[PDB]
Structure 1
Amino acid sequence: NLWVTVYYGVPVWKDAETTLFCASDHNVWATHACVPTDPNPQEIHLENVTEEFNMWKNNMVEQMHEDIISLWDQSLKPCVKLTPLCVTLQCTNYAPKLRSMMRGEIKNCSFNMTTELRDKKQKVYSLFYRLDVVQINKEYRLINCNTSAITQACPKVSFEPIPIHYCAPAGFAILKCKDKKFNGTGPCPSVSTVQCTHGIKPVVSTQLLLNGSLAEEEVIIRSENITNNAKNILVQLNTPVQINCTRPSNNTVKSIRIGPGQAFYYFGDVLGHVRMAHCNISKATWNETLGKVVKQLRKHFGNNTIIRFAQSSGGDLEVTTHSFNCGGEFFYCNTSGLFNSTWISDSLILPCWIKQIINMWQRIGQAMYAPPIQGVIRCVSNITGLILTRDTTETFRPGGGDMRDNWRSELYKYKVVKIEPLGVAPTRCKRR
């Protein structure tokens, strides 16, 4: 009675993992690699369509991670190598007449560096931060000399994040949840289809997520597993918290040449007074934001338990402090002043340290030397989310260091699906 009919172009799809390409409008996240941008992207709303999402199993995050690592290495490859710098340093204190917490943080290191000609050496004095220099027994060496050779970043390549748009190849589509208060997992009834995602900024930080997306209505707490305290908790804020980070000193940069066609940049001197780098967070804004986080966290853990915040318990500086790139400098800030209160049912100042030897992405065996930036650096940014870990009282601490979670906080809304435009259905026909 009924016959088989084949329909081509059927609007169905299946979950799939594929290769996405980039689009954008020197920089590490160069726009020369790809420019297939779209000034007028379209969004086709899918009515009466409910799809399941799982931000913790989303291959887009891993693919982005690899893309960032690859772009990073491509940027660093064509740059000056600093292997001649791994020498014994004769270091003394830069300014003994200091009574602030800055005293002892920067040192006067004297060393014999290679000249353009291989026959002669030059005696060079340079100023280094103590976090980059380790005592061996005066007699200091750079912290990276045992673990890895260090490469100098090219002075002409910016570290400023530029939004990157991910686009699916033909035959695939990206589903955007577009659903207020979605927790990153489970069904989403307001799914829309796009070919390209919005731009994502590859902002690198720990503990606090900067320059990200805000929650549509209220703070959203996302976790792979609430009960399992080994998972990180990603908290998306409803409003931004403005943070003003400054290095209030006028630094003078000097350079020397090491071998033919190479130049080394180093921190030369400080004009005027030497002052400590720091970040300013408004006290009331933070207190209100934290209270909102506590209320949402109590919804998961119960109205009758106490939520306590504490400073990171230990480990690498990249995970015990807040970390960010400001002006090209790498700042490490002590956040113990924020996560120091207990919740029961003016301006805050964070001191910061500057270091030039950065071991990014937790890759042991590679290191970058960040050249100093001339002048005074100030950044103003929005704190958009937190990365928290959990220990009748629940204790939470800042954490991070696994960069994938910073991207999950932005890619949770997107899923990649493959289009399979072949369907079969019964009808009443006999071919001819």
Structure 2
Amino acid sequence: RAENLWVTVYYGVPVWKDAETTLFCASDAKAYETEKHNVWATHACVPTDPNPQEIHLENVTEEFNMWKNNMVEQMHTDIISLWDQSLKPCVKLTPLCVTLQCTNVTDMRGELKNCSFNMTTELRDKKQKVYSLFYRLDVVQINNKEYRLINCNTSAITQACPKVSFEPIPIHYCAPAGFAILKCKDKKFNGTGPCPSVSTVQCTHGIKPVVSTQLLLNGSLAEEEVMIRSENITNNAKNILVQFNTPVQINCTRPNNNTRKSIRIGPGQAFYATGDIIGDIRQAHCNVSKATWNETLGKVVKQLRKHFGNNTIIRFANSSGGDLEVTTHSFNCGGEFFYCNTSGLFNSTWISNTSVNDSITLPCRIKQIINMWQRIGQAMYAPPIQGVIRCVSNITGLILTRDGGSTNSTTETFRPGGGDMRDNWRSELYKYKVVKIEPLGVAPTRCKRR
């Protein structure tokens, strides 16, 4: 009757709403040729498209929050769920809780313990008198010197398979049909607020799931100025994530050339014991070049003054205290798990623009039996590695905390953070968020129908 237009259905209109879905992984279809019996994640893991597509959306402004990002939570539970699936088929070490008779190794206060103990053979009749070599961190005495496994009173224990490797490989997160992933292309982005230039991708960039504390290793570099990120900045309870401009060369080696016993606890099962150490008598150490660490510090200390004020004193110091995972730099190199003393790097005091040799070193401790992510009921034994392990990684960022003692208007001190591994994933995921596409739409037009 009254004119004019009529409703009309449009399919595929550009309308999306912020939402959450279940994301899968992608390995680049080369990681599969890397083989070594299912390295890390990739087994049936989806091959990445040789030509990923990134579409820049013009005349668009979208508001991002990285701390509210849901992609982080899936990845955190993924690595955890990934971890258990790796330890299920492997050999369980349950009857290793046998009494340990230990003694001091032939310098640096006997960090290594030579332990003799009784063990079950293939046959169920006669036991086996054999010795092994454990770090001081893996054992605890109970009251010659008698020791025991450190994890036995807390939980059970299982050995990781020598076939698989913990080597981080690039993993692309993609979204299923009907969804989309937004990417923030600005050079300077702190993870909160509106984003001027936004592009969309089916898959996120190459992300190496490197689990580390107090140091972001093998991560993505920032653009131009170094970045400063915090959930709540003025709040001293929230950690402060830092993104580096130039990568920092770091060396961590295992200056112990070792051998594998490969003792037989059959039928069919074989445990890899740590034999005698042939080589340098040394404790594990981590190298950082004095010139390269300082330059970054000088550029970073200036960025904190875009918040804490033009002029103020910023002092750095080592970890306050807590669990070993919190107080030291924890990571994996060559299959072994290093815990490094970062106290030497964080000893400095800075002026407004400045601070008042050719190398630096960091003492590292080795622990084979670990419970990360506060896991109880499952302890993983890192198998020994033949020969000396040497590794070189990039230091791409930090986890930092601010002191609560204030004296807020006087000076501020920062210390290396730890704990939550989500922050590590938030470091790479800050520029991405998940939305679902709503294709269906209605618009008024004259066509009507016959």
Unaligned runs of 5+ residues in structure 2 are 29-36, 352-356, 404-409
Asked if the contact 2:255–2:280 (Cα under 8 Å) also holds between the matched residues in 1, the reply is no
Q: Take 2:266 and 2:333, find their aligned partners in 1: how far apart are those partners?
A: 31
Cα distance in 1 for residues equivalent to 2:40 and 2:14: 35
Output one character per residue of 1:294-336: Cα deviation in whole Å (capped at 9) or x when no partner. Answer: 1001111112221111111111111100011011110000000
Paired residue total: 426
| Cα distance in structure 1, aligned partners of 2:41 and 2:212 | 20
Cα distance change on mapping 1:102 and 1:28 into 2, 3 Å: farther
TM-superposed deviation, 1:17 = 0.2
Q: Which secondary structure state, in structure 2, belongs to the residue aligned with residue 270 of structure 1?
A: coil
Give the Å deviation of 1:178: 1.1
State whether residues 320 and 327 of structure 2, in contact with CA within 8 Å, keep that contact through their aligned partners in structure 1.
Answer: yes
CA deviations 1:241-278 (Å, max 9, x no partner) are: 00011112211221211131111111100113311111
* Separation in structure 1 between the aligned mates of residue 274 and residue 307 of structure 2, nearest angstrom: 49
Q: Which residue of 1 is the match for residue 46 of structure 2?
A: 35
* Per-residue CA distance 1:322-366 (angstroms, 9 max, x = gap): 011011110000000111111129111011011111112221221
Q: Distance in 2 between matches of 1:364 and 1:300?
A: 40
Quote the offset at 1:5 in angstroms. 2.8
List 4+ stretches of structure 1 deviating above 6 A: none
CA distance in 1, matches of 2:448, 2:171: 52
**Is the contact made by 1:165 and 1:196 (CA closer than 8 Å) also made in structure 2?**
yes
Mapped partners of 2:425, 2:314: distance in 1: 27
Choose the corresponding residue for 1:105, options 96, 101, 111.
111
- The question of whether the paired residues in 1 share the 8 Å contact of 2:227 and 2:242 is answered with yes
Cα offset, 1:400, TM superposition = 1.0
How far the C-alpha of 1:142 sits from its partner, in A, is 0.9
In structure 2, C-alpha distance between the alignment counterparts of 1:286 and 1:279, rounded to whole Å: 13
Distance of 2:63 and 2:279 partners within structure 1: 59
Q: Secondary structure at the residue paired with 1:131? A: helix
Partner of 2:153: 146
| 1:126 Cα deviation after fit | 0.9
* Higher alpha-carbon deviation: 222-231 or 340-349: 340-349
Between 3-12 and 164-173, report the one with greater CA deviation. 3-12
Whether contact under 8 Å (1:219, 1:236) holds in the other structure is: yes
Structure-to-structure mapping, 1:18-167, within 5 angstroms: 18-25=21-28, 26-93=37-104, 102-136=108-142, 138-167=145-174
| Structure 1 counterpart SS, 2:343 | coil
Aligned to 1:411: 429
Q: Counterpart of 1:192 in 2: which secondary structure?
A: strand
Cα distance, 1:429 vs structure 2: 4.3
Q: Distance in 1 between matches of 2:27 and 2:318?
A: 39
Contact kept? 2:114, 2:133, Cα under 8 Å = yes
Q: Is the 8 A contact 1:283 1:347 kept in 2?
A: yes
Q: Distance in 1 between matches of 2:371 and 2:448?
A: 69
Contact kept, 8 Å, 1:219 with 1:296, in 2: the verdict is yes
Structure 1 residues 326 and 143: CA distance shift in structure 2, 3 A = same
Checking the alignment, whether the CA contact within 8 Å between 1:27 and 1:160 is kept in structure 2 is: no
For residues 328 and 216 of structure 2, the distance between their equivalents in structure 1, rounded to whole angstroms, comes to: 13
Q: Mean alpha-carbon deviation: is it higher for 218-227 or for 420-429?
A: 420-429
- Maintained 8 Å contact 2:40/2:164: no
> Shift of residue 199 of structure 1?
1.6
Which residue of the other structure, out of 241, 253, 272, is the alignment partner of 2:279?
272
In 1, the alpha carbon distance for the partners of 2:69 and 2:349 equals 35
**Aligned counterparts of 1:129 and 1:40: Cα–Cα separation in 2:** 48
Report Cα offsets for 1:195-253 as digits up to 9, x if no partner: 11112101010000000000011110011110111111100001100001111221122
8 Å CA contact 2:255–2:279 kept in 1: the answer is no
Q: State the Cα distance separating 1:2 from its structure 2 match.
A: 4.1
Q: Deviations over 1:165-197 (max 9, x none)?
A: 111000001110111111111111111011111
Q: Do the aligned residues in 2 keep the contact of 1:249 with 1:270 (CA within 8 Å)?
A: yes
Q: Deviations over 1:128-157 (max 9, x none)?
A: 100111111911111101011110000111
Q: Deviations over 1:97-126 (max 9, x none)?
A: xxx963310011000011111111010111
TM-score by length of 2: 0.92
In the aligned structure 1, how far is the partner of 2:388 from the partner of 2:273?
A: 16
- Structure 1 gaps of 5+ residues are 94-99
Note if contact 1:27-1:159 (Cα within 8 Å) is conserved in structure 2.
no
8 Å Cα contact 1:28/1:75 also seen in 2: no
Match of 1:418, SS? strand
TM-score w.r.t. the length of structure 1 is 0.96
Tell me how far 1:29 sits from its aligned partner: 2.4
Alignment of 1:255-294 (within 5 A): 255-294=262-301
- Of residues 369, 391, 395 in structure 1, which corresponds to 2:413? 395
